Amino acid sequence: AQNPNCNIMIFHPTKEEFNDFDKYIAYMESQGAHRAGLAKIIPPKEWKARETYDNISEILIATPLQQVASGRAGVFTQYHKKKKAMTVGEYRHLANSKKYQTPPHQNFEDLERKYWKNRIYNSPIYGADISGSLFDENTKQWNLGHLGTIQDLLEKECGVVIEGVNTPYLYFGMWKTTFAWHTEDMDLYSINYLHLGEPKTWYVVPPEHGQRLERLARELFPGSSRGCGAFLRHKVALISPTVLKENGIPFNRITQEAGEFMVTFPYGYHAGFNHGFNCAEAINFATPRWIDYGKMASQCSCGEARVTFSMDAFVRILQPERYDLWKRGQD
């Protein structure tokens, strides 16, 4: 069995290997990359996502989210307070202000220490989940707005034609902006490209050990667990590496820099934080290997997780028993 310790693998495809996205994902899995839950892909040196980022400041962040924490430094939840709209140029200036800027630090490890020590005492503002793309239309390789759609994958594998669409999302981050522990909707893959700016640190649990993380989360967030049998779908809970180590939960960590792709694999729980002002683009995708994960994915029916139009069909076709209850949650 390849990669039996479930280490995060890093790939350096050549320009020729970067042509066929599906084939390269299948290659990485042949080497065991999925066992970690997360892989890094460094694009060939010839490739670029677009020519420059000099003209992005007029993108609108219609609903910036202030991420307010509650709990203790290593075990906390965050809620998202909606703020007034601002442009990317306004948000960059805000990120760079004395109130929000990255503190002086020695290296990524020192910054990581400072994040876990101090995150809860601040409320950084995240421009998350903005439909759109920064890939140039002429970028033909690994262009996250030109991928094969999940609806077309389900149709190719299972024969059933369904409604729905699959488009990318932009994320504008600042120091301490945080993504809570989660798997993707319907335990899909994700791909994330860091277009510009400061790094993003990731934590990930191997898919084969995801239920260990769930059990810990039920112990650490006991009211939330009674409220919902899949409350990590709410995407609000954080658990530090120190706490994970104290409770024996297998995980790994890596830092993504500008110009790098990350892939998350089905049922790979992940969480992380931004080091400073940055912009990422991410989208869900599927392969044939996902279908079995999609059929088994948990679901939130308490009403909190509220998701896209396109997840309806996935539930309806892959999980017809759960459909009725899940749709009640959505309505």
Ligand SMILES: O=C(O)CNC(=O)C(=O)O
């Ligand atoms: O970058 C972020 O804030 C969160 N991204 C993801 O969870 C992802 O790409 O799957």
Ligand SMILES: [Mg+2]
């Ligand atoms: Mg602009």
Ligand code: NI
């Ligand atoms: Ni994710």
Ligand SMILES: [Zn+2]
């Ligand atoms: Zn729920």
